[PDB]
Each structure stands twice: as structure tokens, then as C-alpha cells.
Coordinates of C-alpha atoms in Angstrom, one line a residue:
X1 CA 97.0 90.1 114.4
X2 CA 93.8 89.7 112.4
X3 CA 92.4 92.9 112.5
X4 CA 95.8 95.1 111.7
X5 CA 96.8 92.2 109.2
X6 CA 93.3 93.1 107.4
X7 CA 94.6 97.4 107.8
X8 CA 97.9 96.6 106.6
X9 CA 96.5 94.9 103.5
X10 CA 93.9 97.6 102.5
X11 CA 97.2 100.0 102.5
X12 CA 99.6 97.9 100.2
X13 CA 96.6 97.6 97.8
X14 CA 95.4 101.7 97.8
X15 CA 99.5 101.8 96.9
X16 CA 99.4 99.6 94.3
X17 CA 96.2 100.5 92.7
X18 CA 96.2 104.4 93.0
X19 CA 100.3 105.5 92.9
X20 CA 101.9 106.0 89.4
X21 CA 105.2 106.6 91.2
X22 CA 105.5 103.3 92.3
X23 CA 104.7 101.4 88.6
X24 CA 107.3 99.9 87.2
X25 CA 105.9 101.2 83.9
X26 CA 103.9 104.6 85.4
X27 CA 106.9 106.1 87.3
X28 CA 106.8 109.7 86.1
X29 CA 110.7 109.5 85.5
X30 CA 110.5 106.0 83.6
X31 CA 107.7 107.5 81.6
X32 CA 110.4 109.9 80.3
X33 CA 113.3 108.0 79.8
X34 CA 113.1 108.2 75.9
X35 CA 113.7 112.1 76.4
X36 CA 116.7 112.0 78.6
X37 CA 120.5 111.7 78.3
X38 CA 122.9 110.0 80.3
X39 CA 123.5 113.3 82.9
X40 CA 119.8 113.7 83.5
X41 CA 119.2 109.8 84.3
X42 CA 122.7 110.1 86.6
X43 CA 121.1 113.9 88.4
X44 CA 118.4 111.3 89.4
X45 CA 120.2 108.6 90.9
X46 CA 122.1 111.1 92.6
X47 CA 119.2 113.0 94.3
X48 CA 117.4 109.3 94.7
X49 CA 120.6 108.6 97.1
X50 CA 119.9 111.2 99.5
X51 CA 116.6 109.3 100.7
X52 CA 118.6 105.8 101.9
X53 CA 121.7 108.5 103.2
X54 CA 119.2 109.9 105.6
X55 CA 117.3 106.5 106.3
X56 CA 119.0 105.5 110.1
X57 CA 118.3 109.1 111.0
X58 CA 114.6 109.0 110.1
X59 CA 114.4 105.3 111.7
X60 CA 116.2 106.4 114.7
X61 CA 113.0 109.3 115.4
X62 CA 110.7 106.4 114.8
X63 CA 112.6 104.1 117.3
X64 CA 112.7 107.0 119.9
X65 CA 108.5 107.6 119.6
X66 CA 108.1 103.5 119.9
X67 CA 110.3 104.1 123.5
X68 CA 108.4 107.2 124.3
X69 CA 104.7 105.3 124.4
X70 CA 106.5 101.9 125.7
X71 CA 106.1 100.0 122.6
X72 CA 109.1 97.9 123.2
X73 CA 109.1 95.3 120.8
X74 CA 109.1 98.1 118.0
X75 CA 112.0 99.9 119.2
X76 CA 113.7 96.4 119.3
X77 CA 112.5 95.7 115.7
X78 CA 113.7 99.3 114.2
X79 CA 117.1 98.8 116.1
X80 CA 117.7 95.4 114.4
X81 CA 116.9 97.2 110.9
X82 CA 119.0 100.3 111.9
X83 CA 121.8 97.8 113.1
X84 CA 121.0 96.2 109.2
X85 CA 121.5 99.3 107.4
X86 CA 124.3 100.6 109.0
X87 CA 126.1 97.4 108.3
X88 CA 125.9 94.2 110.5
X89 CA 125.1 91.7 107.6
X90 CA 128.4 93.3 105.7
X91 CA 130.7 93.6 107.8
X92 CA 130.5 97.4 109.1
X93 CA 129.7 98.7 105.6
X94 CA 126.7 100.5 105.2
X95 CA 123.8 100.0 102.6
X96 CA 124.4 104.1 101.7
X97 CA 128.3 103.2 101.2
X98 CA 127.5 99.7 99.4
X99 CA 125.2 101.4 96.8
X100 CA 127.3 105.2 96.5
X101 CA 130.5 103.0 95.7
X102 CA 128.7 100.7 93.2
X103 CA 126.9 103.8 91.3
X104 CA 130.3 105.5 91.1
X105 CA 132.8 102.7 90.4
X106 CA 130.3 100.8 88.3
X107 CA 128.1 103.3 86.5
X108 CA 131.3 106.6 86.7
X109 CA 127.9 108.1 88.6
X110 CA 129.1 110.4 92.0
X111 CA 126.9 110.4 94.5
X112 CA 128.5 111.2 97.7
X113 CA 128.7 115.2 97.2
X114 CA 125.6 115.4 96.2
X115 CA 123.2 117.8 97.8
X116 CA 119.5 118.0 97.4
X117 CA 117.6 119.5 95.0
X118 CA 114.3 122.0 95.8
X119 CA 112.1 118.9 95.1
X120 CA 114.8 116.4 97.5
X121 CA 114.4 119.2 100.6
X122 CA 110.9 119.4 100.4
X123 CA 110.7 115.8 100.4
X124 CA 113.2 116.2 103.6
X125 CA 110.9 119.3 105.4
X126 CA 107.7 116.9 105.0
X127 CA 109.1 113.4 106.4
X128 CA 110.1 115.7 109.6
X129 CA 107.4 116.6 110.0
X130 CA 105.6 113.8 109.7
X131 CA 108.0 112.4 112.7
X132 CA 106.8 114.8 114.9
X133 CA 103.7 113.2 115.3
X134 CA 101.8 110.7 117.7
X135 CA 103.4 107.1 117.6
X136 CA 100.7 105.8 115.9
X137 CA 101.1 107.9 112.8
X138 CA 104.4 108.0 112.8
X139 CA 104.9 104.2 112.5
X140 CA 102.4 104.4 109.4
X141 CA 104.8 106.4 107.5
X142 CA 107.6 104.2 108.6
X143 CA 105.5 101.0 107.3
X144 CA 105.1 103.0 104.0
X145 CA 108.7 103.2 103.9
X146 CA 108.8 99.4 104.4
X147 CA 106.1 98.6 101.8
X148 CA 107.5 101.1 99.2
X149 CA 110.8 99.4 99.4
X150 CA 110.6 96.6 96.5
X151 CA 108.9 98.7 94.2
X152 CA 111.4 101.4 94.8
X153 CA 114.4 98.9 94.1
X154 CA 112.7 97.9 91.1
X155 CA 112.4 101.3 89.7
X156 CA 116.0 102.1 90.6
X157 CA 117.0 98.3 89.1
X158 CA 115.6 99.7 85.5
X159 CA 117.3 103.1 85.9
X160 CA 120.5 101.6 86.1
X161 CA 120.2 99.1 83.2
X162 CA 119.1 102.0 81.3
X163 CA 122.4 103.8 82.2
X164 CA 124.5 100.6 81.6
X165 CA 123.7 99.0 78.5
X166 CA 121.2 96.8 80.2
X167 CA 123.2 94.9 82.3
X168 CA 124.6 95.5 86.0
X169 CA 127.7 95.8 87.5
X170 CA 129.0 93.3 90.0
X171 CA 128.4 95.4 93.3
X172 CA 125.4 97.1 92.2
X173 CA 124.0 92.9 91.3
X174 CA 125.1 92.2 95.0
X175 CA 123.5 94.8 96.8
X176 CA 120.2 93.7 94.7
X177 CA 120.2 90.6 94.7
X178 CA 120.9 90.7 98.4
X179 CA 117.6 93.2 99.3
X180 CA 115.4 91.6 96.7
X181 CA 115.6 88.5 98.2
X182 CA 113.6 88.0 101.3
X183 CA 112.9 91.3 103.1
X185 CA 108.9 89.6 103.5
X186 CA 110.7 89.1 106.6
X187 CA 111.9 93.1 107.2
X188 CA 107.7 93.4 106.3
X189 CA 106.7 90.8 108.7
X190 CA 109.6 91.7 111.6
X191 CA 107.7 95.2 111.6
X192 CA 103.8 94.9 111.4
X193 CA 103.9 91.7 113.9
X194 CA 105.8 93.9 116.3
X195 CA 103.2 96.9 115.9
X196 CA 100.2 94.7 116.1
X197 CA 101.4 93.7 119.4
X198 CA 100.6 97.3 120.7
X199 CA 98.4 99.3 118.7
X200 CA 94.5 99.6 119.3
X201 CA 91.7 99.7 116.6
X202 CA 90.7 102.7 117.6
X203 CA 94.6 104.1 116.3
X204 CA 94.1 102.7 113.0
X205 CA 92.9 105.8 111.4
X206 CA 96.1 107.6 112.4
X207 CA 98.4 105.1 111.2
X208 CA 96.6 105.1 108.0
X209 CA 97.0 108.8 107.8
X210 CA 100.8 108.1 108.1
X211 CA 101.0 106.0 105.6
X212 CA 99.2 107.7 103.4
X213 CA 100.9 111.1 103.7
X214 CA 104.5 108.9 103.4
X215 CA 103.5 108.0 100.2
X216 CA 102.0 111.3 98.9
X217 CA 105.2 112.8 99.7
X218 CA 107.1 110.0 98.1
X219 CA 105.1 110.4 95.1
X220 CA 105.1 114.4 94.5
X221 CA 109.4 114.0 94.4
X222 CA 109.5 111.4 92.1
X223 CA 107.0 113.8 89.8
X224 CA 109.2 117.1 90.8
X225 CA 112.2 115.4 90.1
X226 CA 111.1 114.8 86.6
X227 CA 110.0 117.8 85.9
X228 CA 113.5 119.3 87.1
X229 CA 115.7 116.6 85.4
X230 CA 113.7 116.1 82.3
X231 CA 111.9 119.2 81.7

């Protein structure tokens, strides 16, 4: 409602005022793009991929600590997103598969042996436990998740025109296109269904959720450039 409408918007603005990683033109690895070759740009897109691989699992914990306090319309909405990714809109093809197969047949970039770098695990150790926390914090990192999502698939969007001439394959254009879109509704699906339970007096621990989601998130993109860059 009114009140977690008015928290929800005080968090998408600290992200878009005070995070560099999120910029379109302040990302830490597009700021360095002028000093990489083709294999450094492609070891990022490869370590990127790890984070929607390992997206259903980290949804699933969050759908299992909605059950746990009874908040039932959550675990309804993170089911329908899980049920999403893992390919209910496509035909039984996941979002993972649909973007691995259109960086390696349209870009000649690998993805699916990849395995994570030190600054990718530590991203992985810290998101875990994260999800070991209360409900209430642990559906603030998954709303960060949420609200990190279009400036994420912008960032990636630039990445791979860089690493194809500008342009962008077929597959690569659908799984865009089909994300940056509306979803605005995956936003909306998620913080009407948590304002349904939460209490004010919560607030400061979903905030703290958020907030340490996109910390996290912002110390790998920075890693990651220092490891595939410099």
C-alpha cells in the first residue's frame, strides 16, 4: 500500500542516485571498455552468466522463508516468476539456456563451462547468506534483485554490441526485447504481494536487505574489472 509504496520508492532512488555499478555510463567495467580486447569483454559475460544460472535456486530460498512466516501470496508470486524463468512463457526453455545459447551461437562466447571467478564466489558466499535471514530482509534483497534487473539488462545490452559490431544477434534481440518490455508488471506482481504482509515496524529490515543486495552486486561488478581489465 501507501506506506511500503512510499519505502519501495526511497530504495529505487538511493539505487539510482548513489550506485555507479548500475549507470549505464558509471559501470566500473563500461568505464574500461576502451582498454579491453575481445577475451576480456567475453571473461565478463561469462562470469555475469553465473548470476541468472543460480537465479531459481536463490528465488526458491526466498519462496521457502515467504511459506515459513505464512506470507502466502509471496510464495505464490516467486513461484509464478520461478515457473517464468525456468521456462513457461517459451516453451520449457529456460532464460539461462535462452541467453547461454544466444552468447555462444551469436557472439562464438561459451558460457556454459564456465566456473566462477574469486570475485563471482564471493558474490555467491554473501547472497547465502543473506538468505539465511528473517523474511523480512530476505525479501529486500530479493526486491533489489527485481529493481536491479533493467539496469542490469542494459549494461549487459551495451556489452554485447560492443562485442558485435554494434548490432545484436537474432536470439540475443529476442530474449531482450522480450524482458525489456513490461516486467513493471514482475515489479508490481512482487511489492503488491509483500505489502499485503509486512508491518512498518519491518521496514528497516527489508531496507537492510536491499541495501546489502546491492552492495554485494556492486563490489563484483568493481572486482570483476579489476580481474578482467587490470
Amino acid at each position: 500500500g501507501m506506506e511500503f509504496n512510499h519505502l519501495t520508492k526511497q530504495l529505487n532512488q538511493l539505487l539510482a542516485q548513489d550506485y555507479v555499478a548500475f549507470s549505464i555510463t558509471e559501470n566500473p567495467v563500461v568505464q574500461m571498455l576502451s582498454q579491453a580486447s575481445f577475451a576480456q569483454i567475453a571473461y565478463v559475460m561469462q562470469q555475469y552468466s553465473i548470476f541468472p544460472k543460480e537465479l531459481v535456486g536463490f528465488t526458491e530460498l526466498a519462496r521457502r522463508k515467504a511459506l515459513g512466516a505464512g506470507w502466502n501470496g509471496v510464495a505464490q508470486e516467486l513461484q509464478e516468476n520461478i515457473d517464468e524463468e525456468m521456462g513457461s512463457t517459451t516453451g520449457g526453455i529456460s532464460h539461462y539456456t535462452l541467453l547461454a545459447d544466444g552468447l555462444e551461437e551469436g557472439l562464438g562466447v561459451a558460457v556454459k563451462n564456465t566456473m566462477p571467478s574469486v570475485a563471482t564466489s564471493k558474490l555467491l558466499r554473501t547472497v547465502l547468506s543473506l538468505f539465511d535471514r528473517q523474511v523480512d530482509y530476505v525479501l529486500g534483497a530479493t526486491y533489489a534483485i527485481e529493481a536491479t534487473s533493467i539496469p542490469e539488462l542494459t549494461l549487459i545490452v551495451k556489452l554485447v554490441e560492443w562485442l558485435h559490431e554494434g548490432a545484436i544477434p537474432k536470439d540475443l534481440q529476442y530474449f531482450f526485447s522480450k524482458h525489456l518490455d513490461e516486467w513493471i508488471e514482475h515489479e508490481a506482481g512482487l511489492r503488491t504481494s509483500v505489502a499485503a504482509y509486512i508491518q512498518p515496524e519491518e521496514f528497516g529490515e527489508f531496507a537492510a536487505g536491499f541495501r546489502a543486495m546491492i552492495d554485494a552486486m556492486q563490489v563484483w561488478w568493481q572486482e570483476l574489472a579489476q580481474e578482467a581489465i587490470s
